[PDB]
Amino acid sequence: TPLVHVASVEKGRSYEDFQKVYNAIALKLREDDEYDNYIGYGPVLVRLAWHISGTWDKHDNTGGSYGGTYRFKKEFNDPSNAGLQNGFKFLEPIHKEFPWISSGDLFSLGGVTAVQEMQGPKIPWRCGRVDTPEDTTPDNGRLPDADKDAGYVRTFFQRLNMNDREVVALMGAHALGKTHLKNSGYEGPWGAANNVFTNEFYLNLLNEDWKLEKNDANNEQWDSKSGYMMLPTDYSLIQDPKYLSIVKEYANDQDKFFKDFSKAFEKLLENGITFPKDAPSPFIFKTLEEQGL
Ligand code: HEM
């Protein structure tokens, strides 16, 4: 009924092989530091890994990270994917160096690497995604809109099998990077330390004096006098009572948030994938710093 996507390890590669891909991504992150006014590519990589995974539909098992479909024009040109071509171009040179890794494995590993190199938590990662044909490419319109409320958010995330806790944990990724008018019709960062992974998102949410205003794209965003912004969907996290108590927990405990994020992020990246019992356990990569590199 539902497609079945069995993870298949890239023939004859082990942990050490993947650690080398990780280290290559990481060294390039370190080196190409001028991107987006010195934010670096970390944030776009995280967003890339979420977008390739977010097309999943728990109803017929289509979409998700498995197929590396983002490589196809249809998904690549998804209006909701605007600005991701930058993460793509960053990974190409890497793919050329390690041509045996599948796309889905590379795209998703980029996300893990960025998080960990940006001082976030360790995210267990599993290999085995297999490139699928251009015809398995999901139609556009499965990624969420930003101009909605808590109800939309809850409903949406339900398609990916995420509960309230998972939704709020994952959204704390908004501490990274920023909106770009040209990409999404939103402009501004969510906080100050946008290339370091912290619970800043939650603090800003609770602590700033947010003003609803329209931007130059003629969209409404919540603006703070500190120069930060929140999307309607971000804001909705404090409008819903269930959401708001989680936000509070995270604002209060960065550890808690890190643990929750880690689980939800991995889950997000593994949705739609069946792992045979003989499959290797999830890998935990060392950072550059842990390797002395
Ligand atoms: C309701 C769900 C979400 C909505 C509506 C949303 C919307 C957006 C929008 C409109 C942008 C700005 C794009 C641009 O103009 O460059 C953005 C950026 C970003 N999103 Fe989200 N997002 C959502 C969930 C997530 C999740 C679950 C993650 C990761 C777990 C994530 C990670 C990021 C990151 C890191 C950026 C910054 C990228 C950069 O600086 O290029 N977002 N998101």
Q: Please state, in angstroms and rounded to a whole number, the distance separating the CA atoms of residues 160 and 54.
A: 7
CA distance between the termini of the chain: 48
Burial of 244 (0-12, 13-18, 19+ CB in 10 A): middle
Same domain, 65 and 7: yes
Q: Which of 38, 50, 160, 265 to mutate to test the pocket of ligand 1 (most atoms within 8 A of CB)?
A: 50
CA atoms within 13 A on the CB side of 59: 6
Please say whether the beta carbons of 69 and 137 come within 8 A: yes
Domain count, the chain: 2
Same domain, 60 and 165: no
Same domain, 24 and 169: no
Q: What residues make up the domain containing 190?
A: 144-264
Q: Please state, in angstroms and rounded to a whole number, the distance separating the CA atoms of residues 192 and 196.
A: 9
> Does 44 contact ligand 1 (Cβ within 6 A)?
yes
Same domain, 254 and 120: no
* CA-181 nearest atom, ligand 1: 15
Q: What distance in angstroms lies between residue 11's CA and the mean position of ligand 1's atoms?
A: 34
Question: Which phi-psi region, left, alpha or beta, contains residue 68 (left: φ > 0; alpha: ψ -120 to 50)?
Answer: left
Same domain, 150 and 234: yes
Same domain, 136 and 14: yes
Q: Which helix (H) or strand (E) holds 214?
A: strand 211-214
Structure tokens at 248: 């509070």
**Residue 95 catalytic?**
no
Structure tokens at 237: 């996290």
Residue 116's CATH number: 1.10.520.10
> Does 146 contact ligand 1 (Cβ within 6 A)?
yes
Residue 213's CATH number: 1.10.420.10
Q: Annotation-wise, does 5 bind a ligand?
A: no
Q: Please state, in angstroms and rounded to a whole number, the distance separating the CA atoms of residues 264 and 87.
A: 22
> Does 169 contact ligand 1 (Cβ within 6 A)?
no
What resolution in angstroms does the PDB record give?
2.2
Q: Which residues contact 90 (CB under 8 A, 6 or more apart)?
A: 28, 32, 41, 44, 45, 110
Backbone angles phi, psi at 214, to 5 degrees: -95, 145
- Which position among 56, 125, 190, 222 bears the catalytic label? 190
- Write down the residue that tokens 């728990």 correspond to: 58
Structure tokens at 98: 């390690």
Same domain, 90 and 106: yes
Same domain, 181 and 96: no
> Does 43 contact ligand 1 (Cβ within 6 A)?
yes
Q: Would you say how long the chain is, in residues?
A: 293
Q: Please state, in angstroms and rounded to a whole number, the distance separating the CA atoms of residues 237 and 246.
A: 9
Backbone angles phi, psi at 283, to 5 degrees: -85, 150
Q: Which helix (H) or strand (E) holds 195?
A: none
Same domain, 68 and 148: no
Same domain, 259 and 269: no
> Does 46 contact ligand 1 (Cβ within 6 A)?
yes
Same domain, 163 and 82: no
From which experimental method does this structure derive? X-ray
**Residue 190 catalytic?**
yes
Q: Please state, in angstroms and rounded to a whole number, the distance separating the CA atoms of residues 274 and 264.
A: 17
